[PDB]
Scaffold this active site. Structure first.
Site, PDB file in Angstrom:
ATOM      1  N   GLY A  19       0.812  -1.207   0.000  1.00 22.22           N
ATOM      2  CA  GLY A  19       0.000   0.000   0.000  1.00 22.22           C
ATOM      3  C   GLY A  19       0.844   1.256   0.000  1.00 22.22           C
ATOM      4  N   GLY A  21       2.141   4.873   2.265  1.00 20.87           N
ATOM      5  CA  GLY A  21       2.482   5.327   3.613  1.00 20.87           C
ATOM      6  C   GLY A  21       1.399   6.144   4.298  1.00 20.87           C
ATOM      7  N   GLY A  22       1.278   7.426   3.951  1.00 21.75           N
ATOM      8  CA  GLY A  22       2.123   8.069   2.942  1.00 21.75           C
ATOM      9  C   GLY A  22       3.378   8.711   3.514  1.00 21.75           C
ATOM     10  N   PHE A  23       4.130   9.426   2.678  1.00 16.86           N
ATOM     11  CA  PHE A  23       3.822   9.589   1.256  1.00 16.86           C
ATOM     12  C   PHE A  23       4.549   8.550   0.397  1.00 16.86           C
ATOM     13  CE2 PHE A  23       7.938  11.566   0.976  1.00 16.86           C
ATOM     14  CZ  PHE A  23       8.045  12.385   2.095  1.00 16.86           C
ATOM     15  N   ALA A  24       5.086   7.525   1.055  1.00 18.47           N
ATOM     16  CA  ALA A  24       5.917   6.517   0.405  1.00 18.47           C
ATOM     17  C   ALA A  24       5.117   5.349  -0.172  1.00 18.47           C
ATOM     18  CB  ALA A  24       6.969   6.008   1.374  1.00 18.47           C
ATOM     19  N   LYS A  25       5.732   4.646  -1.120  1.00 14.81           N
ATOM     20  CA  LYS A  25       5.179   3.421  -1.687  1.00 14.81           C
ATOM     21  C   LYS A  25       5.757   2.222  -0.938  1.00 14.81           C
ATOM     22  CE  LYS A  25       4.970   5.609  -6.246  1.00 14.81           C
ATOM     23  NZ  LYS A  25       3.737   5.044  -6.861  1.00 14.81           N
ATOM     24  N   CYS A  26       4.885   1.314  -0.507  1.00 12.29           N
ATOM     25  CA  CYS A  26       5.298   0.168   0.306  1.00 12.29           C
ATOM     26  C   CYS A  26       5.213  -1.161  -0.437  1.00 12.29           C
ATOM     27  CB  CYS A  26       4.487   0.099   1.598  1.00 12.29           C
ATOM     28  SG  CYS A  26       4.861   1.411   2.771  1.00 12.29           S
ATOM     29  N   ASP A 135       2.778   9.921  17.944  1.00 10.54           N
ATOM     30  CA  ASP A 135       1.768   9.594  16.933  1.00 10.54           C
ATOM     31  C   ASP A 135       1.090   8.252  17.206  1.00 10.54           C
ATOM     32  OD1 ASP A 135       1.752   9.643  13.243  1.00 10.54           O
ATOM     33  OD2 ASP A 135       0.161  10.000  14.718  1.00 10.54           O
TER      34      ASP A 135
HETATM   35  C1  LIG Z   1       5.963  -0.243   5.909  1.00 10.30           C
HETATM   36  C2  LIG Z   1       4.934   0.681   6.541  1.00 10.30           C
HETATM   37  C3  LIG Z   1       4.056  -0.019   7.596  1.00 10.30           C
HETATM   38  C4  LIG Z   1       5.024  -0.553   8.595  1.00 10.30           C
HETATM   39  O1  LIG Z   1       5.782   0.271   9.168  1.00 10.30           O
HETATM   40  N1  LIG Z   1       5.157  -1.940   8.875  1.00 10.30           N
HETATM   41  C5  LIG Z   1       6.162  -2.394   9.849  1.00 10.30           C
HETATM   42  C6  LIG Z   1       4.321  -2.882   8.236  1.00 10.30           C
HETATM   43  C7  LIG Z   1       4.401  -4.253   8.485  1.00 10.30           C
HETATM   44  N2  LIG Z   1       3.577  -5.095   7.841  1.00 10.30           N
HETATM   45  C8  LIG Z   1       2.652  -4.666   6.941  1.00 10.30           C
HETATM   46  N3  LIG Z   1       1.875  -5.610   6.351  1.00 10.30           N
HETATM   47  C9  LIG Z   1       0.866  -5.451   5.449  1.00 10.30           C
HETATM   48  C10 LIG Z   1       0.229  -4.231   5.184  1.00 10.30           C
HETATM   49  C11 LIG Z   1      -0.808  -4.165   4.247  1.00 10.30           C
HETATM   50  C12 LIG Z   1      -1.235  -5.304   3.552  1.00 10.30           C
HETATM   51  C13 LIG Z   1      -2.355  -5.235   2.551  1.00 10.30           C
HETATM   52  O2  LIG Z   1      -3.335  -5.939   2.741  1.00 10.30           O
HETATM   53  N4  LIG Z   1      -2.265  -4.427   1.491  1.00 10.30           N
HETATM   54  C14 LIG Z   1      -3.210  -4.494   0.387  1.00 10.30           C
HETATM   55  C15 LIG Z   1      -2.507  -4.858  -0.920  1.00 10.30           C
HETATM   56  C16 LIG Z   1      -3.519  -5.020  -2.056  1.00 10.30           C
HETATM   57  N5  LIG Z   1      -4.309  -3.790  -2.099  1.00 10.30           N
HETATM   58  C17 LIG Z   1      -4.434  -3.067  -3.358  1.00 10.30           C
HETATM   59  C18 LIG Z   1      -4.987  -3.281  -0.905  1.00 10.30           C
HETATM   60  C19 LIG Z   1      -3.936  -3.164   0.201  1.00 10.30           C
HETATM   61  C20 LIG Z   1      -0.634  -6.538   3.790  1.00 10.30           C
HETATM   62  C21 LIG Z   1       0.403  -6.662   4.713  1.00 10.30           C
HETATM   63  O3  LIG Z   1       1.000  -7.877   4.943  1.00 10.30           O
HETATM   64  C22 LIG Z   1       0.386  -9.100   4.530  1.00 10.30           C
HETATM   65  N6  LIG Z   1       2.527  -3.344   6.659  1.00 10.30           N
HETATM   66  C23 LIG Z   1       3.311  -2.414   7.257  1.00 10.30           C
HETATM   67  N7  LIG Z   1       3.180  -1.035   6.951  1.00 10.30           N
HETATM   68  C24 LIG Z   1       2.112  -0.685   5.977  1.00 10.30           C
HETATM   69  C25 LIG Z   1       2.514  -0.659   4.507  1.00 10.30           C
HETATM   70  C26 LIG Z   1       1.554   0.328   3.840  1.00 10.30           C
HETATM   71  C27 LIG Z   1       1.084   1.310   4.942  1.00 10.30           C
HETATM   72  C28 LIG Z   1       1.414   0.645   6.288  1.00 10.30           C
END
Ligand SMILES: CC[C@@H]1C(=O)N(C)c2cnc(Nc3ccc(C(=O)NC4CCN(C)CC4)cc3OC)nc2N1C1CCCC1
EC number: 2.7.11.21
Length: 273
Positions: A19, A21-26, A135
């Protein structure tokens, strides 16, 4: 897509998009050493142009690096190439509490004290390391496969001297202390049990007077111990608020069943008793 670390060798494989952040791509990122998946922030240099954000990204890394706790998201490794900043973080598969509460609305009391115990645990380590989170919110309480909680997002973090839960002392232009985190903690607990924050979260000047002041409605639905604890954490003046040690020893925690461990069915469905 294979990502090589230009400093050290060194190969990673990026998987599914997680997904924004924002504003980053994960993205998912597998360290090939090693062989293990991490949740990763991929921050292109293209959004971090101003010598203002560059400092904020650098700070988060600097602070997150030296943190080592079971209820704090584990920093693994950071590096950068031509494109992009790479921050590799502990993979939490069940996403966050903001997710689970959307599906559930409201949690049962044994669930609430199961999550809070883990939060206070993580925040305590944080506060002993002289770092303040600044936060605290449900979206920043990450949940792994084993239903364990990690506190994350040190984007706003700083050491001792726009957030979800503004404290009265921050609104009195006195800055953020350790008790301002405890304020957020009471808001968190209120939302877990009722599913709406005690105060408006718009951060607009109109809700400022509402949060001076600490005027809010305590619903009848809340049981007495839950009521008495929330009232303590949301006291007007920061000095009146309980210690983190005081919080987990409250009647709310000592009376009642409480796991671990919670089933993940609790993410979508309401648990037995
Ligand atoms: C790195 C940033 C923050 C963080 O700090 N950690 C440690 C983190 C640890 N684990 C996760 N795990 C998952 C987070 C989201 C999903 C998920 O379901 N995403 C979907 C993908 C398909 N889609 C179009 C709809 C959204 C799955 C995850 O693992 C199975 N996310 C984390 N985030 C997130 C990353 C995006 C914002 C927050």
């Amino acid at each position: 897509r294979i990502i090589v670390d230009p400093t050290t060798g060194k190969r990673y494989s990026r998987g599914k998009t997680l997904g924004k952040g924002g504003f980053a791509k994960c993205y998912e990122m597998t360290d090939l050493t090693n062989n293990k998946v991490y949740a990763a922030k991929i921050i292109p240099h293209s959004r971090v142009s101003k010598p203002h954000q560059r400092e904020k990204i650098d700070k988060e890394i600097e602070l997150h690096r030296i943190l080592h706790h079971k209820h704090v998201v584990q920093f693994y490794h950071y590096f950068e190439d031509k494109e992009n900043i790479y921050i590799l973080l502990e993979y939490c598969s069940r996403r966050s509490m903001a997710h689970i509460l959307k599906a559930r609305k409201v949690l049962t009391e044994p669930e609430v004290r199961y999550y809070l115990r883990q939060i206070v645990s993580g925040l305590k380590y944080l506060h002993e390391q002289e770092i303040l989170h600044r936060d605290l919110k449900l979206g920043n309480f990450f949940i792994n496969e084993s239903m364990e909680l990690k506190v994350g997002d040190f984007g706003l973090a700083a050491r001792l001297e726009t957030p979800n839960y503004l404290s009265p002392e921050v609104l009195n232009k006195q800055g953020h202390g350790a008790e301002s985190d405890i304020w957020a903690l009471g808001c968190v607990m209120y939302t877990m049990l009722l599913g709406r924050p005690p105060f408006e979260t718009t951060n607009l000047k109109e809700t400022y007077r509402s949060i001076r002041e600490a005027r809010y409605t305590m619903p009848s639905s809340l049981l007495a111990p839950a009521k008495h604890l929330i009232a303590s954490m949301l006291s007007k003046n920061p000095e009146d608020r309980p210690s983190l040690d005081d919080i987990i020893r409250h009647d709310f925690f000592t009376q009642g069943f409480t796991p671990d461990r919670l089933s993940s069915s609790c993410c979508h469905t309401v648990p037995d008793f």
